[PDB]
Design a protein around this motif. Structure first.
Motif, PDB file in Angstrom:
ATOM      1  N   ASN A 112       0.847  -1.223   0.000  1.00  0.00           N
ATOM      2  CA  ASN A 112       0.000   0.000   0.000  1.00  0.00           C
ATOM      3  C   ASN A 112       0.867   1.251   0.000  1.00  0.00           C
ATOM      4  O   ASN A 112       0.577   2.155  -0.803  1.00  0.00           O
ATOM      5  N   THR A 138       0.564   3.806   1.494  1.00  0.00           N
ATOM      6  CA  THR A 138      -0.330   4.862   2.030  1.00  0.00           C
ATOM      7  C   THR A 138      -0.409   4.675   3.547  1.00  0.00           C
ATOM      8  O   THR A 138       0.346   5.379   4.253  1.00  0.00           O
ATOM      9  N   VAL A 139      -1.158   3.656   4.004  1.00  0.00           N
ATOM     10  CA  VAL A 139      -1.306   3.273   5.446  1.00  0.00           C
ATOM     11  C   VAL A 139       0.077   2.905   6.015  1.00  0.00           C
ATOM     12  O   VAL A 139       0.997   2.598   5.213  1.00  0.00           O
TER      13      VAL A 139
HETATM   14  C1  LIG Z   1      -3.840   0.634   0.739  1.00  0.00           C
HETATM   15  O1  LIG Z   1      -4.239   1.061   2.048  1.00  0.00           O
HETATM   16  C2  LIG Z   1      -5.546   0.674   2.527  1.00  0.00           C
HETATM   17  C3  LIG Z   1      -5.494  -0.705   3.183  1.00  0.00           C
HETATM   18  O2  LIG Z   1      -6.594  -0.864   4.091  1.00  0.00           O
HETATM   19  C4  LIG Z   1      -6.632   0.819   1.448  1.00  0.00           C
HETATM   20  O3  LIG Z   1      -6.864   2.223   1.332  1.00  0.00           O
HETATM   21  C5  LIG Z   1      -8.156   2.707   1.704  1.00  0.00           C
HETATM   22  O4  LIG Z   1      -9.145   2.254   0.772  1.00  0.00           O
HETATM   23  C6  LIG Z   1     -10.463   2.805   0.907  1.00  0.00           C
HETATM   24  C7  LIG Z   1     -11.381   2.161  -0.130  1.00  0.00           C
HETATM   25  O5  LIG Z   1     -11.356   0.734   0.007  1.00  0.00           O
HETATM   26  C8  LIG Z   1     -10.406   4.328   0.753  1.00  0.00           C
HETATM   27  O6  LIG Z   1     -11.693   4.888   1.019  1.00  0.00           O
HETATM   28  C9  LIG Z   1      -9.389   4.931   1.726  1.00  0.00           C
HETATM   29  O7  LIG Z   1      -9.157   6.306   1.413  1.00  0.00           O
HETATM   30  C10 LIG Z   1      -8.018   4.240   1.703  1.00  0.00           C
HETATM   31  N1  LIG Z   1      -7.186   4.791   2.782  1.00  0.00           N
HETATM   32  C11 LIG Z   1      -5.840   4.775   2.818  1.00  0.00           C
HETATM   33  C12 LIG Z   1      -5.214   5.612   3.899  1.00  0.00           C
HETATM   34  O8  LIG Z   1      -5.129   4.153   2.033  1.00  0.00           O
HETATM   35  C13 LIG Z   1      -6.210   0.325   0.060  1.00  0.00           C
HETATM   36  O9  LIG Z   1      -6.120  -1.097  -0.009  1.00  0.00           O
HETATM   37  C14 LIG Z   1      -4.853   0.876  -0.326  1.00  0.00           C
HETATM   38  N2  LIG Z   1      -4.944   2.320  -0.559  1.00  0.00           N
HETATM   39  C15 LIG Z   1      -5.218   2.856  -1.753  1.00  0.00           C
HETATM   40  C16 LIG Z   1      -5.226   4.358  -1.811  1.00  0.00           C
HETATM   41  O10 LIG Z   1      -5.449   2.198  -2.754  1.00  0.00           O
END
Ligand SMILES: *[C@@H]1O[C@H](CO)[C@@H](O[C@@H]2O[C@H](CO)[C@@H](O)[C@H](O)[C@H]2NC(C)=O)[C@H](O)[C@H]1NC(C)=O
Ligand code: ALF
Ligand SMILES: [Mg+2]
Length: 1055
Positions: A915, A917-918
């Motif tokens: 990811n 991101t997280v």
């Molecule tokens: C990687 O990070 C997370 C893992 O849980 C996911 O990201 C979220 O995805 C939801 C939709 O399913 C969004 O509404 C959120 O904004 C996301 N948040 C964050 C902080 O990532 C996903 O699997 C991956 N993130 C992305 C951006 O694809």
């Protein structure tokens, strides 16, 4: 040269700096203090040296600029007008306000005339006692017992506990609760055990040193029995007890003659004659004389009054001023142990802190580029510092010593302070006490000489095979022994004579009837008609004995051979007697002569038995001489050969006569028959002409030197350039004062010799503490002061502690290398994941930190020592090219596999990126974490196996079956975790891999680094020493003893 300064300040200003450090409790101060000297200088608020609370005494050695720092409390006491007393370094430096002058206790001594001590024959009034008591304090050696908070301050000042505390704080903050608890609990027991041990040793020492004997001060108004105990004053007069008495104060005997045991002072149990001091107008103190003075801790066997109503003495030294007190000051106030490994370890641990500072910036920047929250970064940045510097490293290193202690306890050697076992490995010189250590404690009758004709006759080996007739009678009935319930009570030598013959002791005037061993190949059981004692002046005891044959009795007089010869008729006396006596004295055989007078006296009549002591003993025929010596021991000769074969040197330090020391050393094998011994005597400059060094060789059918304590004193002051040349070449030190025994060990260890003392103590107790390894061969006195105590009662302990040390130091090298490699391989893994905005999961860190490291660290330290001692010595230097190269090259291979595996995982088409991101905790299951963790896990097991050297100092690695089993079972768990998709993948947060091929290649990388690490370590181990000689052939040792031995090789000092 001492720098003494006064102190005062504003109470609010003192409270101010107490708000800065006392609230902090010092633990932050040292966290910000490399060393305290800069702070110490002016922390305290200065004032006029006239009036003070504490005194900054900065003692300088001018030659070496040795500015040692001390701070000392001011004592204020009222005699009747307050006098200022300062208790510097134990001893009392007394300040007179009127002259603004410091004067040390014992500055009373001005060479007070022999007549001056005689003038003060009787103690002065309660006003004089009152002021003297104030000037010199009570007659006691005050060992301080410190409080658990005060002990806790010194222990918990250790910086590692500060780092561990910081670490445990951050672990509780970052939710790493399980391991945090383990490090805290381990620390808690370690500190507690240290505090408990520290208090107990002081408690035992305080108990042992305290003496409580009631004494009778002699004053015309004040001469009464048991008037006091601790009140006896340095000028006061006392009555010596008419029987056995332990002397409380160093004193000079004004009236009478005494026999004393000096076993405390010298270690020789044989009694010494002390006579009344002759009244001397000449201004001489008794200090120099050391002859008519009875010391604190000596035992007065016999006290005889002839010229006066009772034996009368005047005190010389009291409390800490007495020699015993000097030794108590010696065993207190101890310098720290200088060990290259321990300091080099701290430098290496410091070097890892510099790498952590670098790592922290890389963490900060890359995590900032990853755009993580500020909060995360401060915890994670700090977390990396605790990854780099391993907080368990001290605890791990102790596990090596803890095992070795357990092995030593089974061998019967009880070791307190087990970290001192490591010092065993580095020992180059073992110093030995003579009496009750190398030799047997009691003198044993070797043989008797007949004197059948005019000239002397050959010595008889077996007293049990006594020649049947007058010699047989004489030997059996020559007893001062008193009959006891199934025992003879009396002097051991007198017992030994009776025992050696095998005769057993059980009319109107018949006393102590003598009977045979109860085997006949003459029984002739005999009665002692009369008995006359061994008066010290006379040097002769006379037993008149009559055998049951209705015959003339014979009077047997046993005396000093010269006195016996003087009494004996010149026709009976031989010309060769002087030469025979001299030869036996030179051989160390104690010569005690027994003479016979045929007596025309009616038996069993008290009138007939009764005569003048001198008239009975006046003229006789010499029946024989009796020869007695120490028998070395059964195991003494073997141990010394092994030490000498190993090239470990042996120095005989004795409080006995030099002639005895020379013969025992030759017997010992310290000086072999081929080896040449030189006797070194230094004449003191009493005439004002400066001191003359004299060198005399000894002839017998590695040139080394034999010395006396007086000589050692003259060399230590009047030949300072030559003292090193003595110390590197001197194998026998004789008649050495208990202070001088410590001083030998001090000057040896300043020459860079790691030094070990083996002794039965009460004289060598100072040396036992001072020596890097101290082995007590007695459970009383020596045991309390010594780090190591045997119950075996032989020198055979010394090789076992060398072996156990050599294993412990080699194990300690391996465990440090493992702990260094584990921290760095974790440091690489954390940074490699941090780059990708990932981390090793919680419970993955726990696998490595808790289960793997603890298992390998506890199981790799079980290996017992090598069977036989070898010439090669374990290395002392942790911060060195051989070890550092191994670590650098091992880490290159480790980094290689991890980076290779990561990029191989990236290269494979099944790979999906994370990811990013997280955050690091939030992305629980990820391929990059899985591959890094999976490869990394095997490396911790690999490195552990690779670093265990085994063979030269320890038993072979294959012998340590538990460690191989532990690695095998841990390896199986890891191999299972990669190979089969398992439930445990959920808890450990690992993602299974579909491609079995890739997993087999991932195991491939493991087996590459396994073979690689073992080969890399092996090749470096084999070639680096050869490479060292190629690179630097002329490379020469920095150790001072090595340099001085070379200089001596070029030109020999006393040739
Ligand atoms: C990687 O990070 C997370 C893992 O849980 C996911 O990201 C979220 O995805 C939801 C939709 O399913 C969004 O509404 C959120 O904004 C996301 N948040 C964050 C902080 O990532 C996903 O699997 C991956 N993130 C992305 C951006 O694809
Ligand atoms: F027994 Al020793 F010096 F030889 F104390
Ligand atoms: Mg002894």
């Amino acid at each position: 040269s001492v720098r003494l300064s006064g102190y005062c300040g504003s109470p609010w200003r003192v409270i101010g700096y107490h708000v800065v450090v006392w609230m902090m409790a010092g633990i932050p101060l040292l966290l910000f203090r490399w060393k305290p000297l800069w702070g110490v200088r002016l922390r305290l608020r200065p004032c006029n040296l006239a009036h003070a609370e504490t005194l900054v005494i900065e003692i300088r050695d001018k030659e070496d600029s040795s500015w040692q720092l001390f701070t000392v409390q001011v004592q204020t006491e009222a005699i009747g007008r307050v006098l200022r007393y300062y208790l510097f370094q134990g001893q009392r430096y007394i300040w007179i306000e009127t002259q603004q002058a410091f004067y040390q206790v014992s500055l009373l001594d001005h060479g007070r005339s022999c007549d001056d001590v005689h003038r003060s024959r009787h103690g002065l009034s309660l006003q004089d006692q009152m002021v003297r008591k104030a000037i010199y304090g009570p007659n006691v050696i005050s060992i301080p017992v410190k409080s658990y908070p005060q002990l806790l301050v010194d222990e918990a000042l250790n910086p590692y506990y500060g780092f561990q505390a910081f670490s445990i704080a951050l672990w509780l903050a970052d939710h790493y609760y399980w391991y945090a608890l383990c490090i805290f609990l381990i620390s808690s027991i370690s500190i507690c055990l240290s505090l408990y041990k520290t208090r107990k040793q002081s408690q035992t020492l305080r108990d042992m040193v305290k003496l409580s004997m009631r004494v009778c001060v002699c004053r015309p108004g004040g001469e009464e029995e048991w008037v006091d105990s601790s009140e006896l004053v340095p000028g006061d007069c006392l009555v010596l007890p008419q029987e056995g008495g332990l002397m409380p104060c160093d004193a000079a005997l004004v009236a009478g003659e005494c026999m004393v045991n000096e076993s405390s002072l010298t270690g020789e149990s044989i009694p010494v004659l002390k006579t009344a001091l002759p009244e001397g107008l000449g201004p001489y103190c008794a200090e120099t004389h050391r002859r008519h003075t009875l010391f604190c801790g000596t035992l007065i066997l016999q006290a005889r009054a002839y010229v006066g109503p009772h034996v009368l003495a005047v005190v010389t030294r009291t409390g800490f001023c007495t020699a015993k007190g000097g030794l108590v000051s010696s065993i207190l106030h101890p310098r720290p142990i200088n060990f290259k490994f321990y300091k080099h370890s701290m430098k290496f641990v410091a070097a890892l802190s510099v790498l952590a500072l670098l790592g922290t910036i890389y963490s900060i920047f890359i995590l900032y580029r990853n755009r993580v929250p500020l909060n995360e970064i401060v915890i994670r940045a700090l977390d990396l510092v605790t990854v780099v510097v391993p907080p368990a490293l001290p605890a791990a290193m102790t596990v090596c010593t803890l095992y070795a202690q357990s092995r030593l306890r089974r061998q019967g050697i009880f070791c307190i302070h087990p970290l001192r076992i490591n010092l065993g490995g580095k020992l180059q010189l073992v110093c030995f006490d003579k009496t009750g250590t190398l030799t047997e404690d009691g003198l044993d009758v070797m043989g008797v000489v007949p004197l059948k004709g005019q000239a002397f006759l050959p010595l008889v080996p077996e007293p049990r095979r006594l020649p049947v007739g007058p010699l047989l009678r004489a030997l059996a009935t020559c007893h001062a022994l008193s009959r006891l319930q199934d025992t003879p009570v009396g002097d051991p030598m007198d017992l030994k004579m009776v025992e050696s013959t095998g005769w057993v002791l059980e009319g109107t005037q018949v006393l102590a009837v003598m009977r045979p061993p109860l085997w006949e190949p003459p029984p002739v059981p005999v009665s002692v008609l009369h008995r006359f004692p061994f008066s010290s002046a006379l040097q002769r005891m006379s037993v008149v004995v009559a055998w049951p044959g209705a015959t003339q009795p014979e009077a047997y007089v046993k005396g000093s051979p010269e006195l016996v010869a003087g009494l004996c008729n010149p026709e009976t006396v031989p010309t060769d007697f002087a030469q025979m006596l001299q030869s036996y004295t030179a051989a160390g055989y104690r010569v005690v002569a027994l003479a016979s007078k045929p007596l025309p006296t009616v038996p069993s009549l008290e009138a007939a038995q009764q005569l003048t002591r001198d008239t009975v003993e006046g003229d006789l025929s010499l029946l024989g001489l009796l020869v007695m010596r120490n028998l070395l021991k059964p195991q003494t000769t073997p141990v010394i050969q092994a030490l000498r074969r190993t090239r470990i040197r042996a120095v005989m330090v004795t409080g006995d006569n030099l002639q005895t020391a020379v013969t025992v050393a030759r017997g010992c094998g310290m000086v072999a028959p081929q080896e040449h011994l030189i006797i070194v005597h230094a004449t003191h400059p009493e005439r004002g002409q400066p001191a003359s060094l004299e060198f005399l060789p000894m002839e017998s059918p590695s040139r080394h030197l034999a010395l006396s304590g007086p000589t050692f004193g003259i060399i230590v002051k009047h030949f300072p350039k030559l003292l090193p040349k003595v110390l590197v070449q001197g194998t026998v030190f004789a008649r050495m004062a208990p202070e001088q025994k410590t001083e030998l060990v001090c000057e040896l260890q300043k020459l860079q010799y790691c030094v070990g003392m083996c002794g039965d103590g009460a004289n060598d107790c100072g040396a036992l503490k001072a020596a890097d390894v101290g082995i007590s061969l007695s459970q009383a006195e020596a045991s309390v002061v010594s780090p190591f105590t045997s119950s075996m009662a032989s020198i055979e302990c010394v090789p076992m502690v060398i072996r156990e040390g050599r294993c412990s130091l080699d194990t300690s090298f391996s465990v440090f290398k493992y702990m260094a490699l584990y921290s760095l391989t974790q440091f690489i893994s954390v940074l490699i994941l941090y780059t990708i905005n990932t981390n090793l999961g919680d419970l993955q860190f726990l696998a490595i930190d808790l289960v793997i490291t603890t298992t390998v660290a506890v199981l790799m330290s079980r290996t017992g020592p090598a069977l036989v001692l070898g010439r090669v010595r374990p290395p002392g230097a942790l911060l060195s090219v051989p070890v550092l190269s191994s670590l650098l090259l091992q880490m290159v291979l480790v980094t290689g596999v991890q980076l290779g595996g990561y990029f191989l995982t990236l290269a494979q088409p099944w790979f999906v990126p994370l990811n990013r991101t997280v955050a690091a905790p939030d992305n629980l299951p990820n391929y990059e974490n899985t591959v890094v963790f999976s490869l990394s896990s095997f490396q911790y097991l690999i490195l552990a196996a690779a670093v265990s050297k085994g063979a030269p100092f320890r038993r072979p690695l294959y012998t340590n079956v538990p460690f191989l089993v532990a690695l095998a079972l841990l390896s199986s768990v890891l191999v299972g975790l990669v190979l089969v998709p398992g439930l445990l993948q959920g808890p450990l947060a690992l993602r299974n891999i579909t491609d079995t091929g890739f997993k087999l290649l991932l195991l491939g990388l493991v087996t590459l680094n396994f073979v690689g690490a073992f080969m890399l370590e092996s090749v470096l181990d084999q070639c680096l020493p050869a490479c060292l000689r190629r690179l630097r052939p002329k490379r020469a040792s920095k150790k001072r003893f090595k340099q001085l031995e070379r200089e001596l090789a070029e030109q020999p000092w006393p040739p």
